[PDB]
Amino acid sequence: VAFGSEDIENTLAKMDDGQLDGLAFGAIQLDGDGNILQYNAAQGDITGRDPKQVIGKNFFKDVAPCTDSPEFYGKFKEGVASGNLNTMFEYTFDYQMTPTKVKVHMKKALSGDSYWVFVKRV
Numbered sequence: 087v088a089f090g091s092e093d094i095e096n097t098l099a100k101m102d103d104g105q106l107d108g109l110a111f112g113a114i115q116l117d118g119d120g121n122i123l124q125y126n127a128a129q130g131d132i133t134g135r136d137p138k139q140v141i142g143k144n145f146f147k148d149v150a151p152c153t154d155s156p157e158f159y160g161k162f163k164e165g166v167a168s169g170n171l172n173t174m175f176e177y178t179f180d181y182q183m184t185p186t187k188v189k190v191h192m193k194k195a196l197s198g199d200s201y202w203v204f205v206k207r208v
């Protein structure tokens with residue numbers, strides 16, 4: 087499955103951990119409050135985070151403070167509220183990692199109270 091696919095949430099809904107770890111792009115699942123439900127191997131290759139240990143943490147408060155901004159967290163909460171989350175933009179990640187330019191795609195999941203954040207290098 088390709089980053090930015092129109093029905094990416096359908097494909098990923100069918101995947102287990104190993105399959106999510108096989109994706110070409112970083113994939114995080116958050117609940118509506120921003121707590122991390124899932125975090126794949128490709129994401130940890132970009133950020134230096136251990137996917138096994140960031141589970142349960144809050145993405146915006148603790149893990150990724152640079153994303154606590156109208157440009158990222160603001161768009162997340164707008165989409166959670168509207169129920170339409172599906173948005174793409176560029177960003178730079180730089181907390182406890184080398185500053186890294188990325189493309190981000192956020193999209194609501196099919197499962198309850200879950201939201202995908204997809205990331206690739208640019």
Ligand SMILES: *C(=O)/C=C/c1ccc(O)cc1
Binds near residue numbers: 181
């Ligand atoms: C800015 O501080 C971003 C940090 C970051 C983004 C994404 C991650 O999965 C981990 C840290």
